Amino acid sequence: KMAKNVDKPLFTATFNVQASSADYATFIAGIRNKLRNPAHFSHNRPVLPPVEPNVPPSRWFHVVLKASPTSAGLTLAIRADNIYLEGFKSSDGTWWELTPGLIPGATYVGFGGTYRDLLGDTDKLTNVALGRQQLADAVTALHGRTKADKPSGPKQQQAREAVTTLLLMVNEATRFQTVSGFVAGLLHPKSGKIGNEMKAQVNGWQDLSAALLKTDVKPPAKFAPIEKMGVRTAVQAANTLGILLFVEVPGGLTVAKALELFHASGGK
Ligand SMILES: Nc1ncnc2c1ncn2[C@@H]1O[C@H](COP(=O)(O)O)[C@@H](O)[C@H]1O
């Protein structure tokens, strides 16, 4: 059940930590546009293709974060089907994986990519500080990771804080316009923490995605509100979502069909 093609990304997206808000916003937009199922939209927002039924994960992209203009960057291995962070490459060339035995030749980092794993309690998410400095510190801490850092309690804690930072500023920002917008603001000519609404959105990507998709089924259908996210209408949901996870909703596309539409449309 090992992954395939981790070393053969579908695309590579690059960001310099010192760049402007504008550069960051289009970096995020670029990732969404390249991940989209060209044939499957919902309320003008892109929707991911389904996870392929019975193969191991074979669709990956890389994000490269450079702490400096010419410096080699930190490479993130992210799944193209569900935007999971599963690996990062260090300056010594070691692949660290976040799921034991998922990436050929990798070394397990010692924890996973859920906020439960990273923070102990998911409520701690609204105390994580985001900004340009945090981004630079997170990238440097993971780029400078050595194998000996794994048996160090405090090093493991710092690595978790660094991964948590990348997850919010890269993965969740891709998923959510609220998050990407929030981060772009911190990079304008610088520290912030997300509120409880963004925390609820980030913990409910599937639910919020599935709720938009339901409104698209052809009737024989209203939007179910999600109070804790602050999202009470289809339009607020469309404005909150950057890209939807594919969810098999009753009367909408099935996994099989959406996948054939993916292939027929020039998607890989
Ligand atoms: N490795 C990961 N990278 C990014 N997001 C993740 C990862 N693992 C879990 N998540 C997020 O957590 C949500 C729920 O995870 P789970 O409920 O444990 O299947 C997912 O839909 C993702 O938004």
- How many whole angstroms separate alpha carbon 32 and alpha carbon 26? 10
The protein residue whose alpha carbon is closest to atom 23 in ligand 1 is 205
Sole residue written with tokens 């599963």 = 86
Place of tokens 């052809």: 218
Domains and CATH numbers, the chain: 1-174 (3.40.420.10), 175-268 (4.10.470.10)
Give the number of other Cβ atoms within 10 Å of residue 227's Cβ. Answer: 9
Helices of type H across 14-75 = 21-35
Bridge partners (DSSP) of residue 62 are 12, 77
**Gaps in the chain (C to N distance exceeding 2.5 A) after:** 189, 220
Measured distance CA(91)–CA(147) in Å, rounded: 11
10, two tokens:
């579908």
From the list 19, 58, 51, the residue with the least C-alpha distance to 37 is 51
From residue 82, give the alpha-carbon distance in Å to each of 51, 209, 241.
7, 12, 14
Least Cα distance to 168 among 193, 196, 197 occurs for 193
Please indicate whether residue 116, judged by its CB atom, sits closer than 6 Å to ligand 1: no
114 ligand 1 Cβ < 6 A: yes
Report the nearest atom of ligand 1 relative to the CA of 79.
3
Closest C-alpha residue for ligand 1 atom 2: 84
With a 6 Å cutoff on the Cβ, whether 61 touches ligand 1 is: no
DSSP letter string, 116-166: HHHHSSGGGGGG--EEHHHHHHHHHHHHT--GGGTT-HHHHHHHHHHHHHH
β-strand partners of 66: 16
Catalytic residue numbers read 172
CA of 189 to the centre of ligand 1 (A): 33
Judge contact between 59 and 52, C-beta under 8 A: yes
Task: Spell out where the chain has E strands.
Answer: 12-16, 41-42, 45-46, 60-66, 74-79, 85-89, 95-97, 107-108, 130-131, 191-192
Place of tokens 């609404």: 197
* Cβ contact 39:139 at 8 Å: no
- Look at strands 107-108 and 95-97 and give their pairing: parallel
- Residue appearing with tokens 């995020």: 28
Method: X-ray
Angle, to 10 degrees, between the axis of helix 21-35 and the axis of helix 177-186?
160
Looking at the chain, how many residues does it have? 268
Tell me the C-alpha distance between 242 and 254, whole Å: 22
